[PDB]
Symmetry: C2
């Protein structure tokens, strides 16, 4: 009995500004959430507390809005499962398949999606609904765009025995 | 009681050719293994079976050589823990801290190191002893060098409660 849950990670007002293709990614994430709601697919929100609990930056980035009945999980680390109620929430929902949108691609999204894979979930990464910022290290620059693309590349070939991983766009992912 | 184990991933003759800074990475990995041996730190080798079991490509890349008493774990997926004897081997050794060198940075190394973190290990990524190849996706190119650098950047900020993660060079990592 596959039960799909949309997992929306840290799409917060203090996180998304400056990210590659920010407005478009937010628009597509919003569309995904609407399609999920229309299809009766549960939506679980994840918020990063170190953004600043109680401040506007911690709240969802426009134009995203949480609906009644949609759980919100608060976390302090990149892995959304680490010291959180996420697993308990998903189990309560009976989730077997996670459809992931969020930010940032190379930190909370990367760490959470790979943790989900490790835990045994089927996972679908929404290729056009995650983003991050330009960065540099060891004397070389790597753009947010490059990180997003490389992340999608990585996920397209991710394999675990008995599990299914899909890279899909926000308007084509099965809900 | 911290017990450190060096985990050397897929440094195989069919894997490393074409990788960024290949000769240097192999040289430094070899030096790391020698220092580990001199310090009585166990070394565990991981080999990727889909490279071609029984073929020369599956064997360690020169100039690496396995010593007596050093376990070798064989795997079929990016996650070295998935359907393998790795956990059993590490537990037998009583490992609490994994020092990771290997290839490729963005596939088996990425997936295994993050799995190790998830499992509760302390993990040290050896910044100058992992590598991968140039690639491209979604119309943008991202070099092996860029991937290595970004990987080190990522690992430098990885955090889990009660766990320690270190980014360190092959000649400075504590053994």
């Amino acid at each position: 009995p596959r039960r799909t849950v949309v997992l929306a990670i840290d799409l917060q007002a203090g996180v998304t500004p400056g990210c590659f293709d920010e407005e478009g990614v937010l628009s597509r994430a919003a569309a995904l959430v609407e399609r999920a709601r229309a299809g009766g697919v549960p939506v679980v929100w994840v918020h990063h507390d170190p953004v600043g609990v109680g401040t506007p930056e911690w709240e969802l980035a426009a134009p995203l809005h949480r609906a009644e009945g949609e759980p919100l999980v608060r976390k302090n680390y990149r892995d959304s499962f680490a010291d959180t109620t996420l697993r308990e929430t998903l189990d309560e929902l009976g989730a077997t398949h996670l459809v992931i949108t969020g930010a940032q691609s190379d930190f909370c999204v990367r760490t959470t999606m790979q943790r989900a894979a490790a835990e045994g979930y089927d996972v679908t990464l929404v290729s056009d609904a995650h983003t991050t910022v330009d960065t540099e290290w060891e004397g070389v620059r790597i753009s947010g765009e490059q990180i997003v693309a490389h992340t999608n590349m990585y996920f397209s070939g991710l394999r675990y025995p008995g599990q299914e991983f899909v890279i899909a766009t926000h308007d084509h992912v099965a809900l």
